[PDB]
Design a binder for this molecule. Structure first.
Ligand SMILES: [K+]
Ligand SMILES: [K+]
Ligand SMILES: [K+]
Ligand SMILES: [K+]
Ligand SMILES: [Mg+2]
Ligand SMILES: [Mg+2]
Ligand SMILES: [Mg+2]
Ligand SMILES: [Mg+2]
Ligand SMILES: [Mg+2]
Ligand SMILES: [Mg+2]
Ligand SMILES: [Mg+2]
Ligand SMILES: [Mg+2]
Ligand SMILES: [Mg+2]
Ligand SMILES: [Mg+2]
Ligand SMILES: [Mg+2]
Ligand SMILES: [Mg+2]
Ligand SMILES: [Mg+2]
Ligand SMILES: [Mg+2]
Ligand SMILES: [Mg+2]
Ligand SMILES: [Mg+2]
Ligand SMILES: [Mg+2]
Ligand SMILES: [Mg+2]
Ligand SMILES: [Mg+2]
Ligand SMILES: [Zn+2]
Ligand SMILES: [Zn+2]
Lengths: 25, 97, 212, 127, 97, 91, 202
RNA sequence: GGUGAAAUUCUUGGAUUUAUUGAAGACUAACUACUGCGAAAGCAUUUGCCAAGGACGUUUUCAUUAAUCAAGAACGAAAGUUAGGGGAUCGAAGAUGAUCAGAUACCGUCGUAGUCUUAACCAUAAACUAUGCCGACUAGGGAUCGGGUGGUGUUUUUUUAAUGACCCACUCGGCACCUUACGAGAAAUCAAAGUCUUUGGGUUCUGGGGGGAGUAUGGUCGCAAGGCUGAAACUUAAAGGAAUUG
RNA sequence: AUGUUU
């Protein structure tokens, strides 16, 4: 996959991980 | 420039700063030129012009305010009017008009 | 089933008192009727006639002239000067690479009341012995040349009426004035007054209009 | 010794207008287009349709009483093409050859001083 | 590798050049990179210069020219054959034909 | 020492009303409580009375201004514009 | 009190009787005490002067503009507001102006305005931050605050009242031809929803 | 109208086209170049104001004040964020027409955010010459920009002479370019990527097979988006560069 | 104009 879209997918994953970690405490 | 001539006068010649001393020098007839700050109140400006025409003294209107005029004469305070008594070695008295 | 041209009548456009030739052509309009006069549908129309056809000589093939109908006088639309522009062909032919294009424009009032915007153009040129292949100016030359041209146009207007300025435009004496006042800054091959624009007219003054 | 109109050929791609007016331009005479003279939706800009439209315009012109025409030809211009479509040359040839007289042909395509960001996006039409 | 000694453009000493739009597809190209061709075609070539001169009311009309500077992107210039693929050594030749 | 990291004058509002609202209030509160230069006597003694009123504690001159600053950008632009129009019409 | 913009008390001489006439102007920004204000056809284009709309060039910014000559000020009176002269029609003497709301209005060229912008601008840029500050704002204007939502009332009290959930129940856009007691909600709304796009229709 | 061809769409309430006007916002064509300026990002209408800057010239002045720089600062395309203004155009989203096996893509028609501006953030780009900066030296050449010098120079007029433009020669500084390479390189190519196993002028930063991974975690900055810093387990014999013939 | 995979 294109490096740009790999980076975009990884950033979306990072956002989801941040959101899950935020909902947890 | 005018600030250079003023600085040379301040370093070499004689001068008074402020309205009261300037009027005293004008009434004594030992003022060669009065420099009036731009933001000097118009009533005081008119009074100084009347005193300068009574004493046949030249008037230069400094383009800056009292803050700028104090800085130009090298002082850390405001100066609304400067009176040149003796030019020292400076051509401020002849390089006018 | 109407044939709108059965109810239209022709008028003759008499543009100048000064150009060379009064008759520039014809124009058609609906016959005047109850609530719609023909003079109302005329009296605003602008025509654009070539200065070559105005002066009779083909050395004015560029510089079209706008003339707006000022009055309707008995099947004769008497017009007046409304603006002048160069042709796209001539302008594009003058604008060439490997040279500096210089443009000036001023807004000035004619002696009587006319507010105009004058667009003058000029181009740098090579000298006769020049080997360098572009002949570009130094933009300080451009500033000085533009100052000179602006002054020249400002003083050509404000000392002439609209009619006298129109009669000065045809000989192109302003071009030669600019050439002579700029020949000591840069050669300036192709000086021209490329555009005159009417920005604001005075009160109508039919007395001044009626000279043709 | 004649009567002059203005030809006002607008030769875009996808169409060609032959629009003769009075010298002023307000009063119009015989505006005919290639889409009037062809039904294919892709011959609207074709030179043949342009020639038929110009012939019709010339007939109506020297039926109304126009004898010569000053020619003003244009492309779409503005921001789009600046190049006269294929029908303009055919329309002007048909106008010349249909009996009308011709005068002062000029290209009046609207040309900006670099205005009006162009359609298509920065990557253009990708065909 | 690097295909062109300078680049596929003409920009050395600049940094940024404002873009232009391809006349054919509207792609944005830096002005120095765009392939620029001047067109000075006659306003009437049309097989009909003689016909237009006959229909003309003016003797010696000197019919004008249409001027147009065309800016092509690389893709459009190659596709429309304004410019063609050249050999490795022929690329190093900047004179027009 | 520095008593607050970022709230500054809006520390009086505690934790209430929202951080963004407290920031928007802080900017204009600093503007409205600042001391400005008197354009008549040249001193840094102009302070706000009520909204739009700006009085010099020295020389006792009061000028109409903005609600939270002595001169709004709109009024400065309007001043320059009217100066330009006056000069153009008179000359 | 109750006004955002400060007032200027301007004293003129009475032209017909020896006495002073005090006038309550809305202060324009930059007007200061001890300043000479000039009002009339021949007054100069200076901030604070009162001029007829015809006597000011196109693009001039005026405040407290008369709708009719002599009504003594109707337009652009709130803090920070101004009228822009966008042109004159000398024949049928009139001035076209841009009002604060964006509306274009044609006014008599004899109507007067004050050069400049109403002082006190930017006032609404500060969050009130407090029911108490809204309270003190309206305490000096009128009893219009606080406002109970009609949807939180009973049907007897308001068209929006009642229901086992708080909800309007019918379209809140109310006809212009509706009667008193019906005109609650968005009276004669041309449109609803978040405004997306540009204003100044043609 | 639009396209390869169409369709959506507008249209005898006159669309499209024509003429005369007006409004708004953006942009600054052509001139425009192997041309200029800036630390870079960038910067192209006129004029005014405000400060700044390089080169040149200099028998002016100071006299080592310098070079490069962890930490630390200023600026930093576009997009994006906050809040006002503005919102013509184009147009992430979205809606639709058409292709197509599907087409929530390319293409067509609209169209929100955005595009513009003010006040604040953000700090990233193939932010590229994929080439740190300072210094010295080692080929040839012709152009070109800026400055300076000289000429029985050409043209231009003011009255001697004069600047200006140009020509010729030289020179300093700059953007580059052409040829050849002693030389360098894996080669492509390179006047620097040379003066390197005959290896040392000064100095900062970075890399150590390919992935996992610019990931997780912690810290810090940020309103957020994100930025900066940044592993490991595990996995793998290639991945990669230049060039040759097919 | 469209034409997938091995
Ligand atoms: K078509
Ligand atoms: K409520
Ligand atoms: K209810
Ligand atoms: K918009
Ligand atoms: Mg292709
Ligand atoms: Mg395809
Ligand atoms: Mg390749
Ligand atoms: Mg760049
Ligand atoms: Mg409420
Ligand atoms: Mg209840
Ligand atoms: Mg009820
Ligand atoms: Mg109801
Ligand atoms: Mg309930
Ligand atoms: Mg069609
Ligand atoms: Mg330009
Ligand atoms: Mg240049
Ligand atoms: Mg660092
Ligand atoms: Mg930006
Ligand atoms: Mg980076
Ligand atoms: Mg890099
Ligand atoms: Mg590794
Ligand atoms: Mg390879
Ligand atoms: Mg296989
Ligand atoms: Zn293209
Ligand atoms: Zn004071």
């Amino acid at each position: 996959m294109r490096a740009k879209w790999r980076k975009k997918r990884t950033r979306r994953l990072k956002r989801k991980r941040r959101k899950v970690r935020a909902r947890s405490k | 420039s005018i600030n250079q001539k003023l600085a040379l006068v301040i370093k070499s010649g004689k001068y008074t700063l402020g309205y009261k001393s300037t009027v005293k020098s004008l009434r004594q007839g030992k003022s060669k030129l009065i420099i009036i700050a731009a933001n000097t109140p118009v009533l005081r400006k008119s009074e100084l012009e009347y005193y300068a025409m009574l004493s046949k003294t030249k008037v230069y209107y400094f383009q800056g305010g009292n803050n700028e005029l104090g800085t130009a004469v090298g002082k850390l305070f405001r100066v609304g009017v400067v009176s040149i008594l003796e030019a020292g070695d400076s051509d401020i008295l002849t390089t006018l008009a | 089933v109407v044939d709108p041209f059965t109810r239209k009548e022709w008028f003759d456009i008499k543009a100048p008192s000064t150009f060379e030739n009064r008759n520039v052509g014809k124009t058609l309009v609906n016959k005047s009727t109850g609530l719609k006069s023909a003079s109302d549908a005329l009296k605003g129309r602008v025509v654009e006639v070539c200065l070559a056809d105005l002066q009779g000589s083909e050395d004015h093939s560029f510089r079209k002239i706008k003339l707006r109908v000022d009055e309707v006088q008995g099947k004769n639309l008497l017009t007046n000067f409304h603006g002048m522009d160069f042709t796209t062909d001539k302008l594009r032919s003058m604008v060439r690479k490997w040279q500096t294009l210089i443009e000036a424009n001023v807004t000035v009032k004619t002696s009587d009341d006319y507010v105009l915007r004058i667009f003058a153009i000029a181009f740098t040129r090579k000298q006769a012995n020049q080997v360098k292949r572009h002949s570009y100016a130094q933009s300080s030359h451009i500033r000085a040349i533009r100052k000179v041209i602006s002054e020249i146009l400002t003083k050509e207007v404000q000392g002439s009426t609209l009619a006298q300025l129109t009669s000065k435009l045809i000989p192109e004496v302003i071009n030669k004035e600019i050439e002579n006042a700029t020949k000591d800054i840069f050669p300036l091959q192709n000086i021209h007054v490329r555009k005159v624009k009417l920005l604001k007219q005075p009160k109508f003054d039919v007395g001044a209009l009626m000279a043709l | 010794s004649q009567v002059f109109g203005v030809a006002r050929i607008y030769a875009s791609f996808n169409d060609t207008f032959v629009h003769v007016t009075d010298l002023s331009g307000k009063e119009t005479i015989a505006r005919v287009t290639g889409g009037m003279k062809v039904k294919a939706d892709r011959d609207e800009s074709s030179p043949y349709a342009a020639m038929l439209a110009a012939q019709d315009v010339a007939a109506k012109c020297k039926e109304v009483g126009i004898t010569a025409v000053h020619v003003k030809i244009r492309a779409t211009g503005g921001t789009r093409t600046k190049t006269p479509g294929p029908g303009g040359q055919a329309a002007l040839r048909a106008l010349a050859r249909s009996g009308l007289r011709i005068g002062r042909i000029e290209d009046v395509t609207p040309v900006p001083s670099d205005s009006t960001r162009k359609k298509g996006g920065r990557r253009g039409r990708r065909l | 590798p690097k295909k062109r000694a300078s680049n596929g453009r003409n920009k050395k000493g600049r940094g940024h050049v404002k873009p232009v739009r391809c006349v054919n597809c509207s792609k944005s190209i830096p002005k120095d990179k765009a392939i620029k061709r001047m067109a000075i075609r006659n306003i009437v070539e049309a097989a009909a210069v003689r016909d237009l001169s006959e229909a003309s009311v003016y003797p010696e009309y000197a019919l004008p020219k249409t001027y147009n500077k065309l800016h092509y992107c690389v893709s459009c210039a190659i596709h429309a054959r304004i410019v063609r693929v050249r050999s490795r050594e022929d690329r190093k030749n900047r004179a027009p034909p | 020492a520095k008593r607050t990291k970022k709230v500054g004058i809006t520390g009086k509002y505690g934790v209430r009303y929202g951080s963004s609202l407290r920031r928007q209030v802080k900017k204009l509160e600093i503007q409205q409580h600042a001391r400005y230069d008197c354009s008549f006597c040249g001193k840094k003694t102009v302070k706000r009375g009520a909204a739009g009123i700006w009085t010099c504690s020295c020389c006792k001159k009061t000028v109409a201004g903005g609600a939270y600053t002595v001169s709004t950008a709109a009024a400065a632009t309007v001043r320059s514009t009217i100066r330009r129009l006056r000069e153009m019409v008179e000359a | 009190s109750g006004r955002g913009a400060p007032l200027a008390k301007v004293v003129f001489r009475d032209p017909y009787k020896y006495r002073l006439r005090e006038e309550i102007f809305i202060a324009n920004e930059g007007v200061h005490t001890g300043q000479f204000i000039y009002a009339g056809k021949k007054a100069s284009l200076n901030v604070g002067n009162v001029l007829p709309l015809g006597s000011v060039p196109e693009g001039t910014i005026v405040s407290n503009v008369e709708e009719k000559p002599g009504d003594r000020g109707a337009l652009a009176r709130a803090s920070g507001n101004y009228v822009i002269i966008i042109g004159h029609n000398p024949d049928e003497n009139k001035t076209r102006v841009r009002l604060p709301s964006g509306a274009k209005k044609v006014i008599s060229s004899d109507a007067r305005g004050v050069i400049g912008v109403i002082a006190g601008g930017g006032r609404v840029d500060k969050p009130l931050l407090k029911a108490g500050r809204a309270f003190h704002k309206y305490r000096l204007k009128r009893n219009s605050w606080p406002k109970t939502r009609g949807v939180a009332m009973n049907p007897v009290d308001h068209p929006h009242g009642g229901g086992n959930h708080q909800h309007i129940g019918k379209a809140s856009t109310i006809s212009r031809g509706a009667v008193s007691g019906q005109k609650a909600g968005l009276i004669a709304a041309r449109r609803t929803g978040l405004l997306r796009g540009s204003q100044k229709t043609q």
